[PDB]
Design a protein around this ligand. Sequence first.
Ligand code: MN
Ligand code: MN
Lengths: 320, 320
Amino acid sequence: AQYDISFADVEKAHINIRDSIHLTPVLTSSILNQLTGRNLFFKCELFQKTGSFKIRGALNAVRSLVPKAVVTHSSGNHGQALTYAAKLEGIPAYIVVPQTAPDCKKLAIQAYGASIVYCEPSDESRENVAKRVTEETEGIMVHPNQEPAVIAGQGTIALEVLNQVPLVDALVVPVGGGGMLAGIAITVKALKPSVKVYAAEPSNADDCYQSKLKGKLMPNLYPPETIADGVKSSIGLNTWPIIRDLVDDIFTVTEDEIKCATQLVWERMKLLIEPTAGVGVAAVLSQHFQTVSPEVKNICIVLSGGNVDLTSSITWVKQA
Amino acid sequence: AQYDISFADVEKAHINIRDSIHLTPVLTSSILNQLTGRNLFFKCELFQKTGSFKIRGALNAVRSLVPKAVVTHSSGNHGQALTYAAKLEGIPAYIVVPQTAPDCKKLAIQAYGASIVYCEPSDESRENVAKRVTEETEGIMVHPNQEPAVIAGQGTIALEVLNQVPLVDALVVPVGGGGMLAGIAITVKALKPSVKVYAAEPSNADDCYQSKLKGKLMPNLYPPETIADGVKSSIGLNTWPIIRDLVDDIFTVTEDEIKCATQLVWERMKLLIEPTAGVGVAAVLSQHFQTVSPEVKNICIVLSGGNVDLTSSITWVKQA
Ligand SMILES: [Mn+2]
Ligand SMILES: [Mn+2]
């Protein structure tokens, strides 16, 4: 009944950020339609300010939380977005980043003027270090996915999608911490609950899937190994209840599927998505998705970001 | 006064192809605006059917030229577009392609069902082989840039741009054979001749520049070596007069500039342009472009194609 955000929070966030973000386009692909048998729509958040949708939750959080500094932990995208948002107000940013995050993300964070602080690649390390930095700097913590203002910001994506694709039957959303999935679920289920909300998740980081299956929050026991570098976080205490109750299903995809789907988008849509964003595309291409009812025809997939290391990616790109 | 096409040809082409092509979007970048001091608009032909604008001239040509087969020579983009267009009518295609064309383009041509015929990398070889194949197959030749129906098809880009960017002050167009540049020049100068039409050309393939300078057609003496694989052709007899009289200026760009600009678009706009399409971006970023009057503020650059070999490109991508 009551979750940590409401639809009204999202509507408000939208008004309050819309003049500072892009109303990103929805693009289509006949090749992907052919491959899936569905009518796909791609919400291009890769074109958002800073390279990902995270500017939404960051701007909303900065504006709303009334400071000496802002602090967060991030695999890169929330960090750069938060940095940018804070810089606009003249507030310094400290960003805790796992040592194994992509270089491109590490560099962008520094380019926006943040103090970057490397941690170990685990949820525990991210959280503990950010807590310590918060204390040391007397800054304000802006969590990448569990903070209500952030979740409400991410949910604004759905307000746009429902307007841009009026006949939409489902949204497909990549899931890490569940900030975006939760905000979108709140939004869709408030406006038009007949529209499906589906999560897409790496098999190699499948806490959300396992949580849903078990009926309780089950965080990743070991730090995930995945090319989907932006969804290694486990779901949290604020997003789980929303996901439990409002998300229709969760589809897992293997590393191979993620790589194949990412490459397909690059080659056929000419959109430089990051592999994390290739998760949702893989989901719709997957065998299990074939079990979704044929009535679920018009599907919008969120292409969540385009912050990818071009040279790293050559490692996995598949020759014909 | 009279050239091989007229504005009316372009208007007609537009009506006749518009239901079979995409009305591609115009995107913007604040980073590129900052770098240039101008207000840039990017016409995303990389999102066109087949990966480039060439579907325009191909569809127009196929529909218009009333056949046993169609024949052409191409570095890849016109070939795949022509193949697709012909396949829609059930007509076989023979495509003459230089041995050194990108694999991705060679493969796509074959995927669309063409018979591919490799030639040497020269204008002379392309032309001579296509003539022979034309004779042998009793097919119809559809030249990639000198055929009036093709030129008129490419010019339709300008009809869209002038509508999408009503305040436009200049178009910047990459030039190879001059099919697109010529069609666009005819169009712009007929509708609103105050709008500048500028060509962008590799220094390593600078026939168009040299022709303009000398006041006569001066083809490349040696086969160009350039990463801009799609603009190695020299201008021809039908496009030159149009270029001579209607194009405002021609900007040359070095290989380094082309690589830098291409990479910038990839990283900052998330648009998987091919290097040929990076030619026009390089032009606007170039030192010489700084000499263009500050009144020329709103500039639309045509991102002409996105048919690039991902793995080849790793050779030149510059680390930070
Ligand atoms: Mn997960
Ligand atoms: Mn040239």
